[PDB]
Symmetry: C3
Subunit: 320 residues, 3 copies
């Protein structure tokens, strides 16, 4: 009959483990998140890149983009010019150049003339925004590599609407001259971009040349009970784009700045901006004591394990 | 006896409660949402602010931004100038200004000289877009406070792909001259921004100074069965950022408008636009009768509670 | 006595079915996704529309927007002009035109005078960006209808962080000269926009006039076990806005390009750009064998079905 009370002890111990460890006495709710970011830093290389230059106006609620490398082509006007030298765009004679837009890779409608691109090579003439943008190989060191030293301030506000409870990842009074540390300052959400790529096992200088995608994962697992109150974030950092060269890594945005000359003709300045798009993913759950939950758990285990206790009871009776 | 059939009655009543109240006969599916917004309104304050002035192009699917307050600094050129005099940017001598150092408060790379801003205030000289933008105190009544009277038309379309059923938050014929009221017109998705912030227990005049974040929460709980058909939206409104002064509330975007002067050198106009970012959160579930589910429920409860019945009959028969 | 071991066989075959089909030996994990898109194509209509022209800078992680139809109003200056002829704006005499307080549909503050719009009709004078933008009905064939032939390259990388495993929807070495095929080339995520709308049962020519919303749904159901390895995406395509005359379909963005005249006064060019906003929705789950999961399943079925077996054993003895 020792085996019997061993089974009873196992059942009781399991019910208490489930109750306490899994907190079956509390209601759970998924958090509702709000993220805001503010960038600080300036790079002076052939131009002064403050935040207004290396950012685009942010209406998104979960991500933000920092420019790390730049290809700029200025004062381009709609006219005729040589195509950029592409396998299908290089020509020896006008017979190679078909009229109109031929493939999706062209920057303009082809006139059919084969015209010099540089001293050495010829290429198909096109009607386009001229001169066509032609580095195509981003600068050997990244232009805005200095962005490694920029800092980002991530204001994350979490809401449990049922519990009417709100938390943020900021200490009650925060000294700005702080840098995030897992143990010493967990409530300092100021991150050096280089440090972020560091925790993601990535080399900023290398990644900055062609861009990429970094996920800032903020996890909240919250107990709102007065006994054992824990509600604080856990950050992890991960690179989301395949780093391998053949698999098309990196990220860039294309944009233009349009101008009008005194004559009235429109002229534009075309940017291809490689950069890192940071995706801020905030998931989490929170729980709080509720009587209805405790009662339903008690009733549930009383029913189920009450049936188990009686069946095991009669089993030991009927056979011994 | 009495206690036995009391237990059987409790079991039967519970199976019925579960079946009907929890609708265990229907398959449930989580909705997939689509939001579009269109803003209407004009403010005449020193300039004519129509939608093209007080919004930025919205490619995001979950949110939209309305400008409420504005700081503009015009005709700034890349050169050297004094930093803006903010405490901890002030200096008496050149040793306080480190050379080539970008600090959290600085708008440019420091030259290392300490230079006059006023007669009275000296500050670290920097290479930056000059003059530096230095209000840091947004206009005392909000510039676009009148935006309180703008209206937003929120077109929400939800799909249940399994059920191949689609719903919108718009009445079958909608008069534009309607304005949302919780009870009188629930399917009028035209909202006065002031009314939204009112529903969020917030003062538009106050919030318009430094900006903020409002969540427009659209809840759908849908029964698609013909005998009890309910599928209509439920709106709630909540401010997501802590409004307290010390915890860094508000929201803004920085952007610039670039021009070129005749010599070709760049000059830009820098905007710091405080405003409200509205985040449209659409959550929801819908359910529809399915035979496979009803059969699974009947089979499940016959199995489990059939075993329970055999326990009570056989086992309590064994005794007495 | 045959019925008893028939019950045992049904239970056993069911345990095996659940184990194998539902893969109860696997830990399951929800997907973490990353999408990048790149647009390629050029349209020649009165101007050269390359990607910098028909797109807006995209910082969002789940969507992208292509312009299909355009209304442009150039050289708009703040001054007085007639309102656009909308029902509430047409007037025969000055008494209908109220001064100052405007309507939500007005483009500027009213002077209170009733002034000529055409030869034929008059309308209320306003202070606004003049001339007001007045087609209100987009061009009868869409101006950028040719975007049908543009291609989009959708780079999707999914991560299972617990299993430390990542996949992408791109073949291991991919030649760009591929076009997506459901069966022949499923790992070629290069789509012609026309073909996208085709798969969604939509006509690009038709949709291009007023725009709309297309959902590109990428589903991953992944088994990472070596003996049964499947991890590849399946795409579906759906139009999210109700295709119907009265229920307000279509999509557009408003933006402006500001210029300065030699005088220094502001001049702007106002765009209403109709287009298709494509939403890339990536959901999925993946699973991998884990010993703790298999053990918890073994223990659970031993517990539950051990009680069931003893119950029916006691029943068959005690009664027949
Ligand atoms: N990425 C970042 N890394 C580090 N710190 C950051 C970062 N982003 C923001 N901060 C700090 O956050 C403070 C509060 O900024 P916040 O109000 O949220 O947004 P803004 O900086 O746009 O200001 P605003 O809301 O418009 O008044 C800023 O004020 C100040 O320090 C700055 C500040 N400044 O930004 O210039 C100057 C200052 N003094 O004393 O000169 C004091 C601050 N402060 O105490 O927070
Ligand atoms: N924020 C808002 N608050 C209130 N109503 C809004 C708002 N946004 C849109 N509406 C109304 O919604 C009607 C349908 O808008 P819709 O046509 O989808 O708008 P878009 O700007 O996308 O234009 P489009 O359809 O592309 O030509 C509009 O037509 C009209 O009333 C407008 C309209 N208008 O100028 O937009 C004028 C009009 N009269 O009578 O002059 C009648 C309308 N109407 O009855 O719907
Ligand atoms: N929507 C699209 N439809 C079809 N193809 C697309 C699309 N988007 C991108 N591609 C192809 O993807 C190739 C790799 O581009 P990717 O690395 O993703 O981005 P970027 O082009 O910005 O990179 P980069 O800055 O050049 O390193 C591009 O190179 C090329 O073909 C282009 C390319 N080009 O973009 O100009 C020229 C070329 N030749 O031979 O001239 C060969 C390519 N190629 O083989 O992939
Ligand atoms: C001319 O252009 C072709 C195409 O890129 C290139 O291979 C060649 O090196 C260029 N020659 C000069 C003079 O730069
Ligand atoms: C100096 O400039 C700062 C700018 O905020 C101001 O606080 C101070 O009163 C000014 N004093 C004079 C004399 O300009
Ligand atoms: C006059 O303007 C109104 C637009 O409301 C239109 O009904 C009418 O046909 C126009 N007549 C012209 C263009 O002569």
């Amino acid at each position: 009959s020792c085996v019997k009370w061993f089974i009873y002890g196992v059942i009781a111990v399991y019910i208490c483990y489930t109750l306490i460890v899994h907190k079956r006495y509390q209601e759970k709710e998924e958090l509702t998140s709000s993220v805001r970011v503010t960038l600080k830093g300036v790079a002076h290389v052939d131009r002064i890149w403050d935040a207004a230059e290396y950012t685009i106006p942010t209406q998104t609620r979960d991500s933000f983009f920092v420019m790390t490398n730049i290809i700029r082509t200025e004062n381009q006007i709609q006219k005729t010019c040589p195509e950029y030298p592409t396998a299908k765009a290089i020509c020896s004679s006008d017979k190679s150049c078909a009229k109109g837009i031929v493939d999706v890779h062209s920057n303009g409608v082809q006139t059919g003339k084969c015209v010099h691109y540089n001293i050495t090579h010829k290429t198909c003439e096109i009607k386009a925004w001229c001169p066509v943008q032609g580095e195509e190989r981003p600068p050997v060191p990244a232009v805005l590599r200095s962005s490694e030293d920029f800092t980002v301030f991530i204001k994350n506000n979490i809401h449990f609407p049922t519990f009417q409870y709100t938390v943020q990842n900021i200490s009650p009074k925060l000294n700005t001259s702080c840098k995030f540390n897992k143990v010493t300052a967990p409530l300092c959400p100021i991150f050096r971009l280089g440090d972020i790529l560091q925790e993601a096992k990535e080399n900023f200088s290398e990644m900055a040349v062609k861009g990429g995608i970094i996920a800032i994962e903020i996890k909240w697992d919250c107990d709102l009970d007065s006994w054992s109150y824990y509600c604080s974030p856990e950050y992890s950092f991960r690179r989301l784009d395949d780093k391998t060269r053949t698999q098309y890594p990196g990220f860039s945005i294309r944009f233009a700045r349009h101008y009008k000359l005194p004559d009235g003709t429109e002229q534009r300045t075309l940017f291809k901006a490689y950069g890192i798009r940071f995706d801020v993913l905030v998931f989490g759950m929170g729980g709080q004591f509720k009587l209805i939950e405790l009662f339903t758990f008690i009733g549930s285990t009383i029913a189920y394990f009450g049936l188990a206790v009686t069946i095991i009871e009669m089993c030991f009776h009927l056979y011994n």
